[PDB]
Design a binder for this molecule. Structure first.
Ligand code: FAD
Ligand code: FAD
Lengths: 113, 113
């Protein structure tokens, strides 16, 4: 019983991590790509819910949600990828917020510093 | 121009990561220690704020907030360590919340699955 109910960390986890993708450079270096890739892989090892970890790991290594080098090309590809991952999880949970990738871009860019 | 104002990611970041520490095993294996250690080091590479990343990296490599092997001993040590890191950032920002470690444990344990 090492897991915590999603009520406390679920949304915070999504918001923080979407913000992370929007802080990615428009034109990243080889180091930026390596660092962010390692972060998102490690993220799967620490989600406070076993089933969540298993599902996440499956998503980032299969289909269009797979974390590949193409996903790390730029801010656009990284933000789109995580957006897709979030939708993949939503669908598995039988929900769909009908939010377009553009709605998300407009939302997070409103917080650009 | 890659940063985001803290209003969107600050609180979410603390909440999600404190939750991560409470999901850590009571009696971790060498593998668990390595995986969580790598995650918390990588977290410093992706905060969407330049000086925030620098401060965090300095906090986890020096002083009482250093991420040493002892911090990874068990759930108690890892959760206390991140509570200390949060207080270190608070002190740097001249913010005082007065929350005790016991208050934090009570809050997150109430969501124990
Ligand atoms: C990596 C990760 C894996 C998870 N895996 C599981 C799991 O396997 N099983 C389980 O029970 N729970 C899982 N969760 C939790 C879950 O996805 C929810 O956070 C939770 O069920 C709470 O639901 P919610 O309806 O508040 O919405 P969230 O999905 O918490 O609410 C997110 C908010 O973001 C918006 N949003 C919706 N879709 C998108 C999108 N595609 N992009 C950007 N914003 C969007 C809306 O504004 C919405 O209110 C996971 C969380 C994370 C962070
Ligand atoms: C690693 C990291 C580094 C950051 N660096 C900076 C920075 O350099 N400059 C800047 O302006 N902002 C920074 N921020 C943001 C900042 O820490 C706040 O999140 C933000 O100012 C909003 O403040 P808030 O009052 O909601 O409090 P947070 O500090 O967001 O609010 C956390 C909430 O957690 C609780 N809490 C407070 N202390 C503790 C504790 N020790 N342990 C557990 N819970 C506690 C209270 O319930 C509180 O409402 C950083 C965030 C992270 C996640």
């Amino acid at each position: 019983a090492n897991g915590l109910i999603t009520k406390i960390w679920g949304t915070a986890g999504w918001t923080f991590n979407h913000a992370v993708t929007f802080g990615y450079p428009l034109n990243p270096t080889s180091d930026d790509k390596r660092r962010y890739k390692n972060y998102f892989i490690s993220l799967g090892d620490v989600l406070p819910c076993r089933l969540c970890r298993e599902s996440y790991k499956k998503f980032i290594t299969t289909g269009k949600t797979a974390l590949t080098n193409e996903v790390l090309r730029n801010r656009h590809t990284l933000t789109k990828w995580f957006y897709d991952v979030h939708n993949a999880v939503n669908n598995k949970l039988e929900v769909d917020y009908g939010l377009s990738y553009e709605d998300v871009v407009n939302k997070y860019e409103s917080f650009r510093a």
